[PDB]
């Protein structure tokens, strides 16, 4: 099945469900049989094993509800959290941002579902995004109860409000993977054309279902989508990021008019370059599963211009080495270090992480010691891939202490993703550096966020953007790679 | 031995072991014992504390050297293990060979500001210290009254038996000859944790293996 | 019962009621006198700060009278009673007088300060005394004591139907031998002083521990 998670090929997944199948542990197989396969071989699973599926029993196991059925009712009965995290970790949340870092809670603390439904209020006084992300928040509290699902959140279904409805449906396709039983209600309409509410609808509604999901009718009812051309960013952001993660571990990739077509219409007009910088976020992700791919090149011929697709260029640089002997791109990796762009060295330095994270016995380096902070930022985001030892905690030592806000509020993140009694005391260290506003609900992120898969690989990469208008917030709560 | 290792056990390791009698008899030694043994070094005394790491989180610290290494550090590193005692509640601190009494008008006020914070003015009954040396008498009294109120025991001239088997053990591969006896190498040696029998049965069988 | 109640009476009456020692008579007391061996010295001290009504105090021990660079005593104490008259006529607890009394000229400058601070009324001279000490061979504060202070009684001593106090305070060992009877080790053993019953936890709690 390692094999498998290397070939990514459909005959290994029968040739083990039938020798699996004939060699009757079982429902452990079935979880990390789901979580070792990819996008690909589970749909190409799902189309064989929904022709023959040998017993009823994989579709029955191996589709859904079976990852999660062991482990919800055995987390909520073998685990006893206690109340005085929410009581106190829970009451010092205020300034109508730690209330934000508070649906961070409300989301990722879920045995005990007392937050959960503490009264009302709490998201009337809270902000738009911040509706976006307490109407997710219940959908991010219901990982399990499909049927508990739709009667929890049928409140914020269709309510007075657009965000409300609209992180309503964000959280109907967070709450599960396989029901696709909620795409009609929001997935029909989907015309405005200019700004009204089936565009943030669009963006849950997009966003969710590609967390839910070569499927083609989705995609042409994306063609609409990206051919209204809203002036907000995560139209496209989870347009590119949605049909991206559909994409994700193709065969050795494509080149066709969809990625073409948005390459096309990203060239149309030179705005906005948050555009340009999230768009070549989907194109390498439809860039990834190549094993011979001479998609770099393709790109490397057709992209050629200035920064902004020749940083999409260097972004299929990133996701096109996604790693093997190669040690070319290594010294070429130390050539083009030096160059004056300070985003190429962002992300084409930032591929570190990914390049080598097996071998991680070389990849401390001197990145730290430069005066190009934004490289201590690399560094400080490829430590947060490991247990935490006591070399990445020492980098963690001097990367803690700093004076610009996001580095200060970029340390408590990969701070946080390397330890999911040594995990309070550098927050107390956090406690003795600040007592911005920006570093006290990250630090609190941090706090409840302490207590080669693309679905952990891709929300991070997509996260570097976090220096910017709080839009960036309403997607930064509803990343599912959080475990 | 059981004896003096389920006191300490019960002792250092209290919030782990058969919660009803903690709170329910309204005993609440949060003081521990302190440990001292001619010998001492930490072989019966690390014999006592290996009870502690079956399941717990341990603490190893043993000798004063890292705080008498520094131009004038002084108790920060035993404020960095109260912190992280602190932070690790249901752990057990063991301090060994402490001979720092025996530049030094500077130790008398380190050893003073360890018997301040082993106190706890200000904190509540968190985490147990486990003093261990190997002369009570170099030791001035300062340490005894607030930090000894418990429990105190006395340990006896050490024991040839356990020394001798690991003399044993560690010269059962080894080739000695009929005129190498084992009561003078035992009967001459004394103060060594264990370690040092080991160290010289490294350096024995080492020295033995250089000629191959 | 009644020594408990010829110490309570001078810690805890003295500031619940102010009134009724002006309007009763000759004057507020003054405190009491606690001498001898130490059997569970220090513990109805703490007993008293549990007591505390209103602010906790500063406790000052013996120890920190005698340090080197002479001259720096005066001015502690002379800071703490400074203390005192800042903080509306503090609590002064002394422990281990003995370590300075029973009279080194740089000693006399502290200890016979010390009755000139004491004995003298300037800061002031009616708060609460008391001394905790263990030998009573100290001469210069058996002949300057009836100057100021007065009742001196037995250190811990009880009546027959006393003990059953420092019993239940003495509750806090490991264990008789289960958690049926706090009575069965609190009246089975009569006739016992105060530090008596300290060799009866230390030796016969000995025989507890040396019973396999």
Partial sequence: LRLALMLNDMELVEDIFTSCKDVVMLGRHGVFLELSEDVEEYEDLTEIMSNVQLNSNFLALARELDIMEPKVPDDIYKTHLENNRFGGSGSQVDSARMNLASSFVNGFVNQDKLLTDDGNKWLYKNKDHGMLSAAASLGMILLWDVDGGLTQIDKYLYSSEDYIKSGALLACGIVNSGVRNECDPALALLSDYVLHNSNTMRLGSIFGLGLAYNREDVLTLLLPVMGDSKSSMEVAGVTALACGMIAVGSCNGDVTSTILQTIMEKSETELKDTYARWLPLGLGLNHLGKGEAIEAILAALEVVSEPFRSFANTLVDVCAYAGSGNVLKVQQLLHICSEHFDSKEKEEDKDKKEKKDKDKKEAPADMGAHQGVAVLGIALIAMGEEIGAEMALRTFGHLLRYGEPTLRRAVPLALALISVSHDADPEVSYNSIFAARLAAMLRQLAQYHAKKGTLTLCPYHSDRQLMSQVAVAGLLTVLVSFL | ?212 | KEQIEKLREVVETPLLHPERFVNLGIEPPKGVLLFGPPGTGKTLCARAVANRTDACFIRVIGSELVQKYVGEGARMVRELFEMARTKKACLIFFDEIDAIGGADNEVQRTMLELINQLDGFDPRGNIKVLMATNRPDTLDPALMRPGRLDRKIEFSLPDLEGRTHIFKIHARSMSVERDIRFELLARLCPNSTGAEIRSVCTEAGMFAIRAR
Avoid: W
Avoid at chain 2, 9 to 29: A, F, Q, R
Avoid at chain 2, 46 to 66: C, D, H, I, Y
Avoid at chain 2, 105 to 114: A, K, N, P, V, Y
């Fill in chain 2, 1 to 212: 031995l059981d004896n003096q290792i389920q006191e300490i056990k019960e002792s250092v390791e209290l919030p782990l072991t058969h919660p009803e009698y903690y709170e329910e008899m309204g005993i609440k030694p949060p003081k521990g014992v302190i440990l001292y043994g001619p010998p001492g070094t930490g072989k019966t005394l690390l014999a006592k504390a290996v009870a502690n790491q079956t399941s717990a989180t341990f603490l190893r610290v043993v000798g004063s050297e890292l705080i008498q290494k520094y131009l004038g550090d002084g108790p920060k590193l035993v404020r960095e293990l109260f912190r992280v005692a602190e932070e690790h509640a249901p752990s057990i601190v063991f301090i060994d060979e402490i001979d720092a009494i025996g530049g030094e008008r500077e130790i008398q006020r380190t050893m003073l500001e360890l018997l301040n914070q082993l106190d706890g003015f200000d904190s509540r009954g968190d985490v147990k210290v486990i003093m261990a040396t190997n002369r009570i008498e170099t030791l001035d009294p300062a340490l005894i009254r607030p930090g000894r109120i418990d429990r105190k025991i006395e340990f006896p001239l050490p024991d040839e038996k356990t020394k001798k088997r690991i003399f044993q053990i560690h010269t059962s591969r080894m080739t000695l000859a009929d005129d190498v006896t084992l009561d003078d190498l035992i009967m001459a040696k004394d103060d060594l944790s264990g370690a040092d029998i080991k160290a010289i049965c490294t350096e024995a069988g080492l020295m033995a293996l250089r000629e191959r």
